[PDB]
Amino acid sequence: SQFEKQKEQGNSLFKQGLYREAVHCYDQLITAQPQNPVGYSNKAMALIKLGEYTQAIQMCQQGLRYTSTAEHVAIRSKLQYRLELAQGAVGSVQIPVVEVDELPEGYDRS
């Protein structure tokens, strides 16, 4: 029986820029024992990273149910912090980290 092993082994994947795998690395906590907010303190940060803010808020309000104690004194406010920003990014973009652009097909050829 384990929990932190599968989750921590994807904390890097969440930071590699391939977030689709990183969602799929924190979902097993919400199914192994959802009685812990940490399962909603990393998925709740990778769903937003693809653009699924709509699903991230549906996880923030399901992790704040498990921060009733000092074992999660910061997660108690990190799911709120992201909820407090998902309602302004589910249809807008002012915190991008992987956006891209090209030339106007008329640049100075240099």
Short mmCIF file of all heavy atoms in Angstrom, two decimals, residues 57-107:
data_model
loop_
_atom_site.label_atom_id
_atom_site.label_comp_id
_atom_site.label_asym_id
_atom_site.label_seq_id
_atom_site.Cartn_x
_atom_site.Cartn_y
_atom_site.Cartn_z
N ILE A 57 -11.36 23.94 -10.42
CA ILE A 57 -12.21 24.49 -9.36
C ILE A 57 -13.03 23.36 -8.74
O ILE A 57 -13.30 23.36 -7.55
CB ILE A 57 -13.14 25.52 -10.02
CG1 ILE A 57 -12.33 26.62 -10.70
CG2 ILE A 57 -14.06 26.20 -9.01
CD1 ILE A 57 -13.24 27.51 -11.55
N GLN A 58 -13.42 22.38 -9.57
CA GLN A 58 -14.16 21.21 -9.11
C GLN A 58 -13.26 20.27 -8.30
O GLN A 58 -13.74 19.26 -7.79
CB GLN A 58 -14.77 20.48 -10.30
CG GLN A 58 -15.81 21.35 -11.00
CD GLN A 58 -16.45 20.60 -12.17
OE1 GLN A 58 -17.15 19.61 -11.97
NE2 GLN A 58 -16.21 21.07 -13.39
N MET A 59 -11.97 20.59 -8.19
CA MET A 59 -11.05 19.83 -7.36
C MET A 59 -10.62 20.68 -6.16
O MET A 59 -10.34 20.13 -5.10
CB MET A 59 -9.81 19.45 -8.19
CG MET A 59 -10.16 18.58 -9.40
SD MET A 59 -10.13 16.79 -9.14
CE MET A 59 -11.41 16.63 -7.88
N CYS A 60 -10.58 22.00 -6.31
CA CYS A 60 -10.20 22.87 -5.21
C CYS A 60 -11.25 22.79 -4.10
O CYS A 60 -10.89 22.73 -2.92
CB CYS A 60 -10.06 24.31 -5.72
SG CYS A 60 -8.67 24.43 -6.87
N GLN A 61 -12.54 22.78 -4.45
CA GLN A 61 -13.61 22.65 -3.47
C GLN A 61 -13.75 21.23 -2.95
O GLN A 61 -14.63 20.97 -2.13
CB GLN A 61 -14.93 23.09 -4.10
CG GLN A 61 -14.84 24.49 -4.69
CD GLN A 61 -16.13 24.87 -5.40
OE1 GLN A 61 -17.21 24.40 -5.06
NE2 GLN A 61 -16.00 25.73 -6.39
N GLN A 62 -12.90 20.30 -3.40
CA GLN A 62 -12.94 18.91 -2.95
C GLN A 62 -11.64 18.55 -2.23
O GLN A 62 -11.46 17.41 -1.83
CB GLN A 62 -13.18 17.96 -4.12
CG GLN A 62 -14.55 18.23 -4.75
CD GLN A 62 -15.06 17.00 -5.48
OE1 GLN A 62 -15.49 16.03 -4.85
NE2 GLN A 62 -15.04 17.02 -6.81
N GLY A 63 -10.75 19.53 -2.06
CA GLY A 63 -9.54 19.35 -1.28
C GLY A 63 -9.61 20.20 -0.02
O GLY A 63 -9.06 19.83 1.01
N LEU A 64 -10.29 21.34 -0.10
CA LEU A 64 -10.55 22.20 1.05
C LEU A 64 -11.43 21.49 2.08
O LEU A 64 -11.65 22.01 3.18
CB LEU A 64 -11.20 23.49 0.53
CG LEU A 64 -10.17 24.39 -0.15
CD1 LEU A 64 -10.90 25.48 -0.92
CD2 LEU A 64 -9.25 25.04 0.88
N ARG A 65 -11.94 20.30 1.74
CA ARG A 65 -12.71 19.44 2.63
C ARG A 65 -11.79 18.59 3.50
O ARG A 65 -12.27 17.84 4.35
CB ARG A 65 -13.57 18.49 1.78
CG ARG A 65 -14.48 19.24 0.82
CD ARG A 65 -15.27 18.21 0.00
NE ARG A 65 -16.16 18.88 -0.96
CZ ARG A 65 -17.21 18.30 -1.54
NH1 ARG A 65 -17.53 17.03 -1.27
NH2 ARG A 65 -17.96 18.99 -2.39
N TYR A 66 -10.48 18.70 3.29
CA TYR A 66 -9.49 17.81 3.87
C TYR A 66 -8.32 18.61 4.46
O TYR A 66 -7.27 18.05 4.76
CB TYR A 66 -9.07 16.82 2.78
CG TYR A 66 -10.24 16.01 2.27
CD1 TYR A 66 -10.61 16.10 0.92
CD2 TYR A 66 -10.95 15.17 3.14
CE1 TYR A 66 -11.71 15.37 0.44
CE2 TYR A 66 -12.05 14.43 2.67
CZ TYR A 66 -12.43 14.53 1.31
OH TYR A 66 -13.50 13.81 0.85
N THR A 67 -8.51 19.92 4.64
CA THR A 67 -7.51 20.82 5.19
C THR A 67 -7.95 21.34 6.56
O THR A 67 -7.55 22.41 6.99
CB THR A 67 -7.26 21.98 4.22
OG1 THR A 67 -8.47 22.61 3.89
CG2 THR A 67 -6.61 21.45 2.95
N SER A 68 -8.79 20.56 7.25
CA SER A 68 -9.37 20.88 8.55
C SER A 68 -8.34 20.88 9.68
O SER A 68 -8.71 21.04 10.84
CB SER A 68 -10.46 19.86 8.86
OG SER A 68 -9.89 18.57 8.95
N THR A 69 -7.05 20.69 9.38
CA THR A 69 -6.02 20.56 10.40
C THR A 69 -4.68 21.12 9.92
O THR A 69 -4.48 21.35 8.72
CB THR A 69 -5.90 19.08 10.79
OG1 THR A 69 -4.79 18.88 11.64
CG2 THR A 69 -5.75 18.19 9.56
N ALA A 70 -3.77 21.35 10.87
CA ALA A 70 -2.47 21.96 10.64
C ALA A 70 -1.57 21.14 9.71
O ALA A 70 -0.56 21.66 9.23
CB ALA A 70 -1.79 22.15 11.99
N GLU A 71 -1.92 19.88 9.43
CA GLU A 71 -1.17 19.05 8.51
C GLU A 71 -1.22 19.61 7.08
O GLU A 71 -0.48 19.16 6.21
CB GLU A 71 -1.72 17.63 8.51
CG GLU A 71 -1.51 16.95 9.86
CD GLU A 71 -2.03 15.51 9.84
OE1 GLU A 71 -3.23 15.33 10.13
OE2 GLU A 71 -1.22 14.61 9.53
N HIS A 72 -2.10 20.60 6.85
CA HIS A 72 -2.34 21.16 5.53
C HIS A 72 -2.55 22.67 5.63
O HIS A 72 -3.23 23.25 4.78
CB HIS A 72 -3.58 20.49 4.92
CG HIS A 72 -3.69 19.02 5.25
ND1 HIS A 72 -2.91 18.00 4.71
CD2 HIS A 72 -4.58 18.49 6.14
CE1 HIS A 72 -3.35 16.87 5.30
NE2 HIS A 72 -4.35 17.14 6.15
N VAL A 73 -1.97 23.30 6.65
CA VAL A 73 -2.17 24.71 6.97
C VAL A 73 -1.97 25.64 5.76
O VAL A 73 -2.56 26.72 5.72
CB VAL A 73 -1.24 25.10 8.12
CG1 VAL A 73 0.23 25.11 7.70
CG2 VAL A 73 -1.62 26.47 8.69
N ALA A 74 -1.16 25.22 4.79
CA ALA A 74 -0.94 26.02 3.59
C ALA A 74 -1.86 25.57 2.46
O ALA A 74 -2.38 26.41 1.73
CB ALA A 74 0.53 25.88 3.17
N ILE A 75 -2.08 24.26 2.29
CA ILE A 75 -2.99 23.76 1.27
C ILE A 75 -4.40 24.30 1.53
O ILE A 75 -5.20 24.46 0.61
CB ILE A 75 -2.97 22.22 1.25
CG1 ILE A 75 -1.56 21.71 0.95
CG2 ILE A 75 -3.94 21.69 0.20
CD1 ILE A 75 -1.49 20.18 0.89
N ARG A 76 -4.70 24.59 2.81
CA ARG A 76 -5.94 25.19 3.26
C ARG A 76 -6.22 26.52 2.57
O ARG A 76 -7.36 26.99 2.55
CB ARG A 76 -5.81 25.39 4.77
CG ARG A 76 -7.10 25.90 5.41
CD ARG A 76 -6.83 26.15 6.89
NE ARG A 76 -8.00 26.73 7.56
CZ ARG A 76 -9.00 26.01 8.09
NH1 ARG A 76 -9.00 24.68 8.04
NH2 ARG A 76 -10.02 26.64 8.67
N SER A 77 -5.18 27.12 1.99
CA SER A 77 -5.28 28.40 1.32
C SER A 77 -4.75 28.35 -0.11
O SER A 77 -4.96 29.30 -0.86
CB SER A 77 -4.49 29.44 2.13
OG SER A 77 -5.07 29.59 3.40
N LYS A 78 -4.06 27.27 -0.51
CA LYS A 78 -3.58 27.16 -1.88
C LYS A 78 -4.69 26.75 -2.84
O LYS A 78 -4.67 27.15 -4.00
CB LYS A 78 -2.43 26.16 -1.97
CG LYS A 78 -1.12 26.67 -1.36
CD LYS A 78 -0.71 28.05 -1.87
CE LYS A 78 -0.86 28.16 -3.39
NZ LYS A 78 -0.26 29.41 -3.90
N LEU A 79 -5.67 25.97 -2.38
CA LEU A 79 -6.79 25.59 -3.22
C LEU A 79 -7.72 26.79 -3.33
O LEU A 79 -8.36 26.99 -4.36
CB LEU A 79 -7.51 24.40 -2.61
CG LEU A 79 -6.83 23.07 -2.95
CD1 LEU A 79 -5.33 23.08 -2.64
CD2 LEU A 79 -7.48 21.97 -2.12
N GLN A 80 -7.81 27.59 -2.27
CA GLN A 80 -8.58 28.81 -2.30
C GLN A 80 -7.90 29.83 -3.20
O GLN A 80 -8.57 30.53 -3.95
CB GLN A 80 -8.69 29.38 -0.88
CG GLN A 80 -10.00 28.99 -0.20
CD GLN A 80 -11.21 29.26 -1.09
OE1 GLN A 80 -12.12 28.43 -1.18
NE2 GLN A 80 -11.25 30.40 -1.77
N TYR A 81 -6.57 29.93 -3.13
CA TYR A 81 -5.79 30.84 -3.96
C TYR A 81 -6.02 30.56 -5.44
O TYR A 81 -6.12 31.50 -6.23
CB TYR A 81 -4.31 30.64 -3.62
CG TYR A 81 -3.36 31.19 -4.66
CD1 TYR A 81 -2.91 32.51 -4.58
CD2 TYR A 81 -2.93 30.36 -5.70
CE1 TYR A 81 -2.02 33.02 -5.55
CE2 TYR A 81 -2.05 30.86 -6.68
CZ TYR A 81 -1.60 32.19 -6.60
OH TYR A 81 -0.74 32.68 -7.55
N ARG A 82 -6.10 29.29 -5.83
CA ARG A 82 -6.27 28.96 -7.23
C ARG A 82 -7.74 29.08 -7.64
O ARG A 82 -8.03 29.40 -8.79
CB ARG A 82 -5.72 27.57 -7.51
CG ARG A 82 -5.76 27.24 -9.01
CD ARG A 82 -5.02 28.29 -9.85
NE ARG A 82 -3.58 28.29 -9.56
CZ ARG A 82 -2.70 29.12 -10.13
NH1 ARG A 82 -3.11 30.05 -11.00
NH2 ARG A 82 -1.41 29.02 -9.84
N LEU A 83 -8.66 28.84 -6.70
CA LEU A 83 -10.08 29.03 -6.95
C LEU A 83 -10.32 30.53 -7.15
O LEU A 83 -11.09 30.94 -8.02
CB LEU A 83 -10.84 28.46 -5.74
CG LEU A 83 -12.31 28.14 -6.01
CD1 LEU A 83 -12.87 27.35 -4.83
CD2 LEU A 83 -13.18 29.37 -6.24
N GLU A 84 -9.64 31.34 -6.34
CA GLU A 84 -9.67 32.80 -6.37
C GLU A 84 -9.02 33.37 -7.64
O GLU A 84 -8.94 34.59 -7.78
CB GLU A 84 -8.96 33.31 -5.12
CG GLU A 84 -9.93 33.24 -3.94
CD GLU A 84 -9.24 33.53 -2.61
OE1 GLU A 84 -8.47 34.51 -2.55
OE2 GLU A 84 -9.49 32.76 -1.65
N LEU A 85 -8.55 32.51 -8.55
CA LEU A 85 -7.95 32.94 -9.81
C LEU A 85 -8.51 32.16 -10.99
O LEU A 85 -8.41 32.61 -12.13
CB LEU A 85 -6.43 32.77 -9.74
CG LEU A 85 -5.76 33.69 -8.71
CD1 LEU A 85 -4.28 33.34 -8.62
CD2 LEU A 85 -5.88 35.16 -9.13
N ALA A 86 -9.10 30.98 -10.75
CA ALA A 86 -9.70 30.18 -11.80
C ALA A 86 -10.95 30.86 -12.35
O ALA A 86 -11.26 30.74 -13.53
CB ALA A 86 -10.05 28.81 -11.24
N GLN A 87 -11.67 31.58 -11.48
CA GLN A 87 -12.86 32.32 -11.85
C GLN A 87 -12.50 33.57 -12.66
O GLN A 87 -13.37 34.39 -12.95
CB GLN A 87 -13.61 32.70 -10.57
CG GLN A 87 -14.05 31.45 -9.80
CD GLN A 87 -14.89 31.80 -8.57
OE1 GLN A 87 -14.73 32.87 -7.98
NE2 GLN A 87 -15.79 30.91 -8.18
N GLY A 88 -11.23 33.70 -13.04
CA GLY A 88 -10.72 34.80 -13.84
C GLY A 88 -9.73 34.30 -14.89
O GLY A 88 -8.99 35.09 -15.47
N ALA A 89 -9.72 32.99 -15.14
CA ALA A 89 -8.84 32.37 -16.12
C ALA A 89 -9.55 31.24 -16.88
O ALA A 89 -9.01 30.72 -17.85
CB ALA A 89 -7.60 31.83 -15.41
N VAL A 90 -10.76 30.87 -16.45
CA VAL A 90 -11.57 29.87 -17.14
C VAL A 90 -12.04 30.39 -18.50
O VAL A 90 -12.51 29.62 -19.34
CB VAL A 90 -12.76 29.51 -16.24
CG1 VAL A 90 -13.76 30.66 -16.14
CG2 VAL A 90 -13.47 28.25 -16.73
N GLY A 91 -11.92 31.70 -18.71
CA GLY A 91 -12.32 32.35 -19.95
C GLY A 91 -11.40 33.52 -20.32
O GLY A 91 -11.75 34.33 -21.17
N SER A 92 -10.22 33.59 -19.69
CA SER A 92 -9.25 34.65 -19.93
C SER A 92 -7.84 34.12 -19.74
O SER A 92 -7.65 33.01 -19.24
CB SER A 92 -9.47 35.81 -18.97
OG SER A 92 -10.79 36.32 -19.09
N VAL A 93 -6.84 34.91 -20.14
CA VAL A 93 -5.45 34.49 -20.09
C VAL A 93 -4.55 35.69 -19.81
O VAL A 93 -4.39 36.57 -20.65
CB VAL A 93 -5.04 33.83 -21.41
CG1 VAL A 93 -3.63 33.26 -21.29
CG2 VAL A 93 -5.99 32.69 -21.79
N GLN A 94 -3.98 35.71 -18.60
CA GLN A 94 -3.04 36.74 -18.18
C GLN A 94 -1.91 36.15 -17.33
O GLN A 94 -1.17 36.89 -16.69
CB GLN A 94 -3.80 37.85 -17.46
CG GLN A 94 -4.50 37.38 -16.18
CD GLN A 94 -5.87 36.81 -16.51
OE1 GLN A 94 -6.73 37.50 -17.05
NE2 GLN A 94 -6.10 35.55 -16.18
N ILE A 95 -1.77 34.81 -17.34
CA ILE A 95 -0.72 34.11 -16.62
C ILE A 95 -0.17 32.94 -17.47
O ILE A 95 0.02 31.84 -16.95
CB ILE A 95 -1.22 33.60 -15.25
CG1 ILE A 95 -2.15 34.62 -14.57
CG2 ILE A 95 -0.01 33.33 -14.34
CD1 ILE A 95 -2.62 34.14 -13.19
N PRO A 96 0.09 33.14 -18.77
CA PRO A 96 0.58 32.09 -19.64
C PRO A 96 2.03 31.73 -19.31
O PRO A 96 2.76 32.53 -18.72
CB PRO A 96 0.47 32.64 -21.06
CG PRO A 96 0.63 34.15 -20.85
CD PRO A 96 -0.06 34.38 -19.51
N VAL A 97 2.44 30.52 -19.69
CA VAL A 97 3.78 30.01 -19.42
C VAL A 97 4.29 29.12 -20.56
O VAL A 97 5.40 28.59 -20.45
CB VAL A 97 3.80 29.23 -18.10
CG1 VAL A 97 3.58 30.17 -16.90
CG2 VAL A 97 2.73 28.14 -18.07
N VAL A 98 3.51 28.95 -21.63
CA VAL A 98 3.89 28.11 -22.76
C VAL A 98 3.41 28.70 -24.09
O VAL A 98 3.46 28.03 -25.12
CB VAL A 98 3.33 26.69 -22.59
CG1 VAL A 98 4.03 25.94 -21.46
CG2 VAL A 98 1.82 26.71 -22.33
N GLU A 99 2.93 29.95 -24.08
CA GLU A 99 2.45 30.60 -25.29
C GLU A 99 3.56 30.75 -26.33
O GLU A 99 4.75 30.70 -25.99
CB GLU A 99 1.84 31.96 -24.96
CG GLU A 99 2.89 32.92 -24.39
CD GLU A 99 2.29 34.29 -24.06
OE1 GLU A 99 1.19 34.60 -24.58
OE2 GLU A 99 2.95 35.03 -23.29
N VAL A 100 3.18 30.93 -27.60
CA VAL A 100 4.12 31.07 -28.69
C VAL A 100 3.59 32.03 -29.75
O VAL A 100 2.38 32.25 -29.84
CB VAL A 100 4.36 29.67 -29.27
CG1 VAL A 100 3.18 29.19 -30.10
CG2 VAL A 100 5.63 29.64 -30.12
N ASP A 101 4.49 32.60 -30.55
CA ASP A 101 4.17 33.55 -31.61
C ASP A 101 5.18 33.41 -32.75
O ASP A 101 6.20 32.74 -32.60
CB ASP A 101 4.22 34.97 -31.05
CG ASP A 101 3.12 35.23 -30.03
OD1 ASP A 101 1.96 35.44 -30.48
OD2 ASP A 101 3.42 35.22 -28.82
N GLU A 102 4.89 34.05 -33.89
CA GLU A 102 5.76 34.03 -35.05
C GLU A 102 5.89 35.43 -35.65
O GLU A 102 5.31 36.39 -35.15
CB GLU A 102 5.22 33.07 -36.10
CG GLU A 102 4.76 31.75 -35.49
CD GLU A 102 4.45 30.71 -36.56
OE1 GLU A 102 5.39 29.98 -36.95
OE2 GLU A 102 3.28 30.66 -37.00
N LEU A 103 6.65 35.54 -36.74
CA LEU A 103 6.89 36.81 -37.42
C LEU A 103 5.64 37.20 -38.22
O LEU A 103 4.78 36.36 -38.49
CB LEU A 103 8.09 36.67 -38.36
CG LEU A 103 9.44 36.36 -37.69
CD1 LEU A 103 9.76 37.37 -36.59
CD2 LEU A 103 9.52 34.95 -37.10
N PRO A 104 5.52 38.48 -38.60
CA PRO A 104 4.38 39.03 -39.31
C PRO A 104 4.51 38.83 -40.81
O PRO A 104 3.90 39.56 -41.59
CB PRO A 104 4.39 40.51 -38.93
CG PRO A 104 5.88 40.83 -38.82
CD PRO A 104 6.51 39.51 -38.35
N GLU A 105 5.31 37.84 -41.23
CA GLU A 105 5.54 37.53 -42.64
C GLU A 105 6.06 38.75 -43.41
O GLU A 105 5.89 38.85 -44.63
CB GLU A 105 4.28 36.94 -43.26
CG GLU A 105 3.92 35.61 -42.60
CD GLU A 105 2.68 35.00 -43.23
OE1 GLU A 105 1.57 35.32 -42.76
OE2 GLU A 105 2.85 34.21 -44.19
N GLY A 106 6.69 39.69 -42.70
CA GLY A 106 7.22 40.92 -43.29
C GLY A 106 8.32 41.53 -42.42
O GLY A 106 8.61 42.71 -42.55
N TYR A 107 8.92 40.72 -41.53
CA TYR A 107 9.98 41.17 -40.65
C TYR A 107 11.22 41.63 -41.42
O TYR A 107 11.31 41.45 -42.64
CB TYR A 107 10.33 40.06 -39.65
CG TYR A 107 10.99 38.84 -40.24
CD1 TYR A 107 12.34 38.58 -39.96
CD2 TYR A 107 10.26 37.97 -41.06
CE1 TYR A 107 12.97 37.45 -40.50
CE2 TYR A 107 10.88 36.84 -41.61
CZ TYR A 107 12.24 36.57 -41.33
OH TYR A 107 12.84 35.47 -41.87
#
